[PDB]
Amino acid sequence: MAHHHHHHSSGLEVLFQGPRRAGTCCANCQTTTTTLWRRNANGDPVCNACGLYYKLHNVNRPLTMKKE
Ligand SMILES: [Zn+2]
Numbered sequence: 001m002a003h004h005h006h007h008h009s010s011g012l013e014v015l016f017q018g019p020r021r022a023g024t025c026c027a028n029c030q031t032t033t034t035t036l037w038r039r040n041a042n043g044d045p046v047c048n049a050c051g052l053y054y055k056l057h058n059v060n061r062p063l064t065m066k067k068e
């Protein structure tokens with residue numbers, strides 16, 4: 001029809017691997033405020049950053065502990 005990559009979620013922009021999981025927690029930073037639940041090596045749910053980052057670098061995203 002008219003499909004296009006309009007990133008309405010400014011700041012959450014990784015379109016590799018997979019989609020999302022709605023109401024989950026991040027296999028790294030336990031954030032639950034995430035609209036883009038990607039998978040890690042185990043197929044474990046990760047928020048935009050930890051999935052975006054691992055996709056670039058094959059590793060989790062140095063950020064916080066595990067719960068901030
Ligand atoms: Zn995360």
